[PDB]
Amino acid sequence: RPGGDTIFGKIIRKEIPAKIIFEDDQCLAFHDISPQAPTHFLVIPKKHISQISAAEDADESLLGHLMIVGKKCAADLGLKKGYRMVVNEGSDGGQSVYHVHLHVLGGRQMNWPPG
Amino acid sequence: RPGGDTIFGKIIRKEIPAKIIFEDDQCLAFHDISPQAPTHFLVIPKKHISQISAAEDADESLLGHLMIVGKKCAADLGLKKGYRMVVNEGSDGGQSVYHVHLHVLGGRQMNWPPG
Numbered sequence: 595r596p597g598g599d600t601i602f603g604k605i606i607r608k609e610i611p612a613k614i615i616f617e618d619d620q621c622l623a624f625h626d627i628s629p630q631a632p633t634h635f636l637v638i639p640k641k642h643i644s645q646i647s648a649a650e651d652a653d654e655s656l657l658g659h660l661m662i663v664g665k666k667c668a669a670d671l672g673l674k675k676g677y678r679m680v681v682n683e684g685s686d687g688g689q690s691v692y693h694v695h696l697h698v699l700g701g702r703q704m705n706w707p708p709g
Numbered sequence: 710r711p712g713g714d715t716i717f718g719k720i721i722r723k724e725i726p727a728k729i730i731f732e733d734d735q736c737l738a739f740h741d742i743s744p745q746a747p748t749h750f751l752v753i754p755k756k757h758i759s760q761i762s763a764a765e766d767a768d769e770s771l772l773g774h775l776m777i778v779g780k781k782c783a784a785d786l787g788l789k790k791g792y793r794m795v796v797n798e799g800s801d802g803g804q805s806v807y808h809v810h811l812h813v814l815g816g817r818q819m820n821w822p823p824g
């Protein structure tokens with residue numbers, strides 16, 4: 595089973611449905627099931643990296659790719675006014691799914707602190 | 710003037726002081742002046758990219774590098790329990806400084822939504 599064995603791995607293999615917004619050979623983007631902003635989606639790599647602390651130096655381009663796709667999708671969805679990108683790491687970060695993912699939230703004004 | 714003409718460009722050129730945690734040929738990391746968590750630092754590229762929406766495809770590795778450094782520094786600072794990485798884009802994102810930067814916050818439990 596490619597893409598790892600998490601909720602996100604099942605989405606990658608198309609075992610469970612998702613609202614796919616973009617997909618390329620390296621990653622996939624889909625809407626969040628519990629949105630915290632009018633537009634709230636996730637960008638995940640097809641390669642299974644459990645968390646950012648486990649990313650290797652060679653994973654550098656793939657991690658930057660998730661942000662370039664997040665930026666392009668946010669443009670497609672009409673987020674002219676901006677957005678906020680978030681990566682949660684571990685317990686204190688609020689990570690509940692152990693497959694690296696990037697949150698892209700917009701459509702409203704984001705506050706500070708970021709949680 | 711290299712590193713652009715923002716508060717962050719002055720930090721890069723060493724015109725104004727900062728608590729530097731890490732520096733390499735591509736980026737620099739320093740503590741935030743108004744921390745929102747026990748440990749709160751920024752990772753910025755030396756190359757001037759005003760905002761994530763203005764990042765080009767070739768900037769992919771540099772953007773991923775900021776996260777790899779954020780991950781390594783967070784390890785140095787003892788963030789065993791996790792952290793949250795944030796990039797603010799534009800007005801809705803809460804961007805006040807127009808030089809791409811990554812926030813790394815930890816030391817306490819981060820909440821949801823992220824602002």
Ligand SMILES: Nc1ncnc2c1nc(Br)n2[C@@H]1O[C@H](COP(=O)(O)O)[C@@H](O)[C@H]1O
Nearest residue numbers: 601612625626627628629682688689690691
């Ligand atoms: N099947 C699914 N489709 C869309 N997003 C999902 C999902 N299952 C989960 Br869990 N989510 C989202 O995955 C996110 C988990 O992110 P953290 O691990 O950073 O909390 C949550 O925002 C949650 O709503």
Ligand SMILES: Nc1ncnc2c1nc(Br)n2[C@@H]1O[C@H](COP(=O)(O)O)[C@@H](O)[C@H]1O
Nearest residue numbers: 716727740741742743744797803804805806
């Ligand atoms: N001289 C400085 N040294 C440390 N951080 C700084 C700074 N000047 C500024 Br502005 N900051 C920080 O830069 C951040 C700006 O991030 P946003 O643009 O995403 O709000 C704030 O968290 C602020 O505290």
